[PDB]
């Protein structure tokens, strides 16, 4: 008893909406998260609250980040879809999306528009999943990279045994973290390990190895952003900002970080945020030698905002320059 080591993931439910064949739903949820994003997740212990408040809490390493109260009338949960039908709209914490509760007739009407709607137990799964995608970078450390590299040795022994003698594990783990953080799938381990073996002796910076590994997954990146090959509602950055960041980066040579002028950071942030309010959804483009720093700036907010570059863009990808930036 009193063993050290917190519990990874645990779900607290009121017994009014419990054991409605929830186990199968959460299984089928994680068995799909795995093949969607590669990271394998741990089992989900479920706790029963002797409570009347019909509440649910999802505790992450014995510390809470999601807790919601479901009204009695709630049913036929819809999640952040179009405003065609509005039964009851709601906003989630930390900007994790918006939900909407629907009536049966409104649910059928929504289904008519080709959307999807959940009811019964599957609403719990579709909400838990929405919670997890926001916190996928938590389940990748020095101890899970080892599990992946031990699973591989079944069929790729001579590849991992050759990757090991080029990098220490505490850099492979960092690279995988930097990748899965930006919602880039890592299910193709063969290609990542190959690209890491190629460039390892020529470079000792994980922050650069990540960029090189990122260039090589153009198909696996674009196929997800732009199904059926539609033109990209892109944006662009201003040459002044590009140059400013360019000289700021070299301000330090060893740490490889950029000296920050808040009297430029703040303006860049506000100007970008205002520009996105024009409904230019995603696909901010930038120079190759700055994308990492640009994402470093934004990650504090506006998460789920892709920051691509020209190298990740195919020679014949269909483009529409919808906006441009003037600050300098």
Residue numbers in the entry: 345 to 672
Reproduce passages from the article:
The protein at the heart of both T3SS secretion and secretion specificity belongs to the SctV/FlhA family (injectisome and flagellar system names respectively). While only injectisome members have been given unified Sct names, the SctV/FlhA family is conserved across all T3SSs of both flagella and injectisomes, which assembles early into the inner membrane, and is central to T3SS assembly and function. The ~75 kDa SctV is composed of an N-terminal transmembrane domain functioning as a proton-protein antiporter export gate, and a C-terminal cytoplasmic domain (SctVC) implicated in funneling selected substrates to the export gate. SctVC’s substrate specificity is mediated by a trimeric “gatekeeper” complex formed of SctW (in SPI-2, SsaL) and a heterodimeric chaperone (in SPI-2, SsaM and SpiC, lacking unified Sct nomenclature).
In the SPI-2 T3SS, SctV is often referred to by its original species-specific name SsaV; here we call it SctVSPI-2. To better understand the role of SctV in SPI-2 translocon-effector specificity switching, we purified full-length SctV and determined its toroidal cytoplasmic region’s structure using cryo-EM. Central to specificity switching is a nonameric SctV protein with an N-terminal transmembrane domain and a toroidal C-terminal cytoplasmic domain. Structural comparisons and molecular dynamics simulations revealed that the cytoplasmic torus is stabilized by its core subdomain 3, about which subdomains 2 and 4 hinge, varying the flexible outside cleft implicated in gatekeeper and substrate binding. SctVSPI-2 also features a short C-terminal extension not found in other branches of the SctV protein family, apparently required for efficient control of substrate specificity by the gatekeeper. In light of patterns of surface conservation, deprotonation, and structural motion, the location of previously identified critical residues suggest that gatekeeper binds a cleft buried between neighboring subdomain 4s. Simulations suggest that a local pH change from 5 to 7.2 stabilizes the subdomain 3 hinge and narrows the central aperture of the nonameric torus. Our results are consistent with a model of local pH sensing at SctV, where pH-dependent dynamics of SctV cytoplasmic domain affect binding of gatekeeper complex.
